[PDB]
């Protein structure tokens, strides 16, 4: 039994350490790794540490523990909402901009507190823990979870026991994501998590510095999946106590807030050394208290936060572009891009906005479509630097011809990207309307639908811009300057 798991993890480690098999076999590799992980999971006993009470049975201890250490505990209560899970609900009227939530640093779990814990000796030895603060947080969480007298037990006992990150998806739920951009990040997350589990399983067994860890006695795959999912769905970047650099931290109590659209209203107060949150909007008594997590895409929300946000105003897809080495004007284009601070090839973003492209992508596309004569004007003479300076400004085109070319290219490229999907937008909408699906299945289908809808809007916006600049060209309008 004990030698069997070591065999499987060794088999899992070589499998997940192997290089990518090419993109055409990435699904087969994913299923192969899934098969090994489930075999290990069926031979283990789930979470090493489980608690007798329900999740809500421990929230009063969280409040008492946070109150003794200087945190705000009045004006809100914990409620199990259907849509978002557990969250905060106001018990009094809270006005927008009111400072209603604060958490002193003493309560936080940080990379620094991980270094000072029982994990300290192993942390001082393992290059992965030293380089990856998020993984160190995950093991800090696991070691304190298995320590009954831990200072952070009131926080750990109120954490979720499961998440909706793709690590928890069924095979057929991930299968909805075939042919999308997002599935490659799902592949990487699964392979990384499996490789990390097998690596640290062997490290804990071979390193004498790990002999005092509770994980030396029990460390299951379920433990690791839970720990990394807890960190990825809740971790935060804060300044060190010195204020000279940044670190990663879990912030109890405040991280129970669920997400809505708006602005970030949570910041660190270094003078008083505590996290502070002001109300994003008015919250009447009985209304859920929301915060704005950040300007993340729905792909990021699904993969790293475990939920899909309808009406995400910051949604985007990726588009990879680069100047071809077979372009006769490669050297000139690469130099103009270098002088503008833009790489010759990169992954850009297409936004669900008008225009769908940033200033950096606009600048790239302009250089991408420049003639030799236009390139020389951005490389030579007393006006070249001024021309570089306006490259990302929609109000100052290189020429009407350059604009028509770049919007034609983007229209063609976004149209071609749409042709690489296994389903159409209308088919996805029919699936959502006519099938009865799990939460995780709809996250996947809405993800693949959102990718095509962003590309479809980008096609329409580029076609409209092509016609605008074509009109300027045929009317011989003076260039703005």
């Amino acid at each position: 039994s004990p030698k069997e798991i070591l065999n499987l993890t060794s088999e899992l480690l070589q499998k997940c350490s192997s290089p990518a098999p090419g993109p055409g076999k990435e699904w087969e590799e994913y299923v192969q790794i899934r098969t090994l992980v489930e075999k290990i999971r069926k031979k283990q006993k789930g979470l090493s540490v489980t608690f007798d009470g329900k999740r809500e049975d421990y929230f009063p201890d969280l409040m008492k523990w946070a109150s003794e250490n200087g945190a705000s505990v009045e004006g809100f209560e914990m409620v199990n909402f259907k849509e978002e899970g557990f969250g905060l609900r106001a018990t009094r009227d809270i006005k927008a901009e009111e400072l209603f939530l604060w958490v002193p640093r003493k309560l936080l779990m940080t990379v620094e507190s991980a270094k000072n814990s029982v994990l300290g000796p192993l942390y001082s030895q393992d290059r992965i823990l030293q380089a990856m603060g998020n993984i160190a947080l995950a093991f800090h969480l696991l070691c304190e979870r298995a320590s009954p007298n831990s200072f952070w037990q009131p926080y750990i006992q109120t954490l979720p026991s499961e998440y909706d990150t793709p690590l928890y998806f069924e095979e057929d739920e991930v299968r909805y994501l075939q042919s999308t951009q997002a599935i490659h990040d799902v592949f990487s997350q699964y392979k990384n998590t499996a490789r990390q589990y097998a690596y640290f399983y062997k490290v804990i067994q071979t390193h004498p510095h790990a002999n005092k860890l509770p994980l030396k006695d029990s460390f299951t795959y379920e433990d690791y999946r839970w720990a990394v999912s807890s960190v990825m769905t809740r971790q935060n970047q804060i300044p060190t106590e010195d204020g000279s650099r940044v670190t990663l931290a879990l912030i109890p109590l405040w991280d129970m807030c669920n997400h809505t659209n708006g602005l970030i209203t949570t910041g660190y107060n270094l003078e008083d050394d505590r996290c502070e949150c002001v109300a994003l909007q008015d919250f009447r008594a009985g209304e859920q208290i929301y915060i704005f997590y950040g300007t993340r895409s729905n792909a990021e929300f699904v993969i790293h936060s475990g939920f899909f946000f309808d009406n995400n105003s910051h949604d985007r897809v990726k588009i990879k572009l680069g100047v071809s080495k077979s372009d006769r004007l490669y050297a000139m284009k690469a130099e103009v891009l270098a002088r503008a601070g833009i790489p010759t090839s990169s992954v850009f973003a297409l936004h669900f906005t008008e225009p769908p492209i940033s200033a950096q992508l606009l600048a790239f596309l302009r250089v991408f479509c420049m003639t030799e004569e236009e390139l020389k004007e951005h490389l030579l003479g007393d006006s070249a630097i001024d021309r570089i300076f306006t490259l990302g400004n929609s109000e100052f085109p290189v020429s009407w011809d350059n604009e028509v070319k770049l919007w034609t290219f983007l229209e063609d490229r976004a149209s071609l990207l749409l042709k690489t999907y296994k389903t159409t937008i209308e088919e996805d909408k029919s699936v959502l309307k006519n099938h009865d699906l799990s939460v995780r299945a709809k996250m996947a289908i809405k993800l693949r639908l959102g990718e095509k809808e962003i590309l479809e809007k980008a096609v329409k916006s580029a076609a409209v811009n092509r016609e605008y600049y074509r009109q300027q060209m045929e009317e011989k309008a003076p260039l703005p300057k």
Partner: peptide, 15 residues
């Protein structure tokens, strides 16, 4: 504005 804005669930690299 916010000197140290805190992003709930900020995305990190896992390898």
């Amino acid at each position: 504005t916010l000197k140290y804005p805190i992003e709930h669930g900020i995305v990190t690299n896992w390898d």
